[PDB]
RNA sequence: CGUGAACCUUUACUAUAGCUUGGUAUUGAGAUUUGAUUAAAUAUGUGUAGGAUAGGUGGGAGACUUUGAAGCUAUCUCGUC
């Protein structure tokens, strides 16, 4: 009923901008609970091309994430000073192997990767193993913690050239949602492979928790 | 003997008349059908264990609810029945 009404109130042939689409979604928002609005981008993706990056959203609208630190020497103390939700050691590795999963993400130092290697069979189930590609493993443990606090998220491209990121929540302001979407679009464009000629992104739409997806006018300036 | 002729031969080289096949112009109206592609409608997707038909992605814990709920029955498309 509510979904039918929202679908009726959404126009598929209309090309509304980001703010207009956010306003329409908020008006058609029949989900009583605060809903995180996602963005689906169906762009030109190459067969052998991999699309993956990480971007810190301009506003932190996601719930707190348990940031764990795995480092030796002064690395654990530095993470604790930066505000690590959990600071661990080989004892932390043993706790994880026992089932220590009260945190949302795990970051490790280059040395702590020696113990984190045993975390492949444990962390690899959820994909939380430390890595340098996503900034989880690096010399800036404080930088990774700050990005996680700001709401850094990893974007990936599907096998059909599609991606589905989170731009915030319905309760978040229209300006905040627009800023997050613009930052994500700019990051995607900058990651757009130069080996492809034309439009890197074909279409972009925004869908709420239950609201029908609305495709915005894809204009790059 | 001459980087000379002529005619003749052929699975020597390169062309060509003739013959042949397709497109197009002369050259129109119809109908049926096999397609392909364009989108849109719409369904469909069962390793294993597992509550069971778990295709994938992410948002994702509330949503739907006389605009006919649970869910009874008949029946249809798929069925790995």
Swiss-Prot record:
Family the UniProt entry places it in: Belongs to the universal ribosomal protein uL1 family.
Alphabetical list of Pfam families matching this protein: Ribosomal_L1 (PF00687)
Family annotation (PROSITE patterns): RIBOSOMAL_L1 (PS01199)
Domain of life: Bacteria
Any one GO MF annotation of this record: structural constituent of ribosome
Subunit structure: Part of the 50S ribosomal subunit.
Organism: Borreliella burgdorferi (strain ATCC 35210 / DSM 4680 / CIP 102532 / B31)
Keywords for the protein's UniProt record, in alphabetical order: Repressor, Ribonucleoprotein, Ribosomal protein, RNA-binding, rRNA-binding, Translation regulation, tRNA-binding
Any single biological process term in GO: regulation of translation
Record's function text: Binds directly to 23S rRNA. The L1 stalk is quite mobile in the ribosome, and is involved in E site tRNA release. Protein L1 is also a translational repressor protein, it controls the translation of the L11 operon by binding to its mRNA.
Entry's Gene Ontology cellular component terms: large ribosomal subunit
Protein name as annotated: Large ribosomal subunit protein uL1
């Amino acid at each position: 009923k509510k979904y039918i009404e929202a679908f009726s109130k959404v126009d598929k042939n209309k090309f509304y901008n980001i703010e207009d689409a956010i306003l329409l979604l908020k008006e058609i928002k029949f989900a009583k609970f605060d809903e995180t609005i996602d963005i689906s981008i169906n762009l030109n993706l190459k067969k052998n091309h991999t699309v993956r990056d990480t971007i810190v959203l301009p506003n932190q609208f996601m719930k707190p994430k348990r940031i764990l630190v795995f480092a030796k020497g002064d690395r654990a103390d530095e993470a604790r000073a930066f505000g690590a939700t959990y600071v661990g050691d080989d004892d932390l590795i043993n706790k994880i192997k026992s089932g220590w999963d009260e945190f949302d993400v795990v970051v490790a130092t280059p040395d702590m990767m020696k113990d984190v290697g045993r975390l492949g069979p444990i962390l690899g189930k959820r994909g939380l193993m430390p890595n340098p590609k996503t900034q989880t493993v690096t010399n800036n443990l404080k930088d990774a913690i700050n990005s996680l606090k700001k709401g850094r998220t990893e974007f990936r491209a599907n096998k059909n050239g599609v991606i589905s990121f989170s731009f915030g929540k319905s309760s978040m302001d229209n300006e905040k949602i627009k800023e997050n979407y613009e930052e994500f679009v700019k990051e995607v464009v900058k990651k757009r492979p130069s080996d492809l000629k034309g439009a890197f992104i074909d279409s972009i739409y925004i869908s709420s928790t239950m609201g029908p997806s609305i495709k915005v006018n894809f204009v790059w300036r």
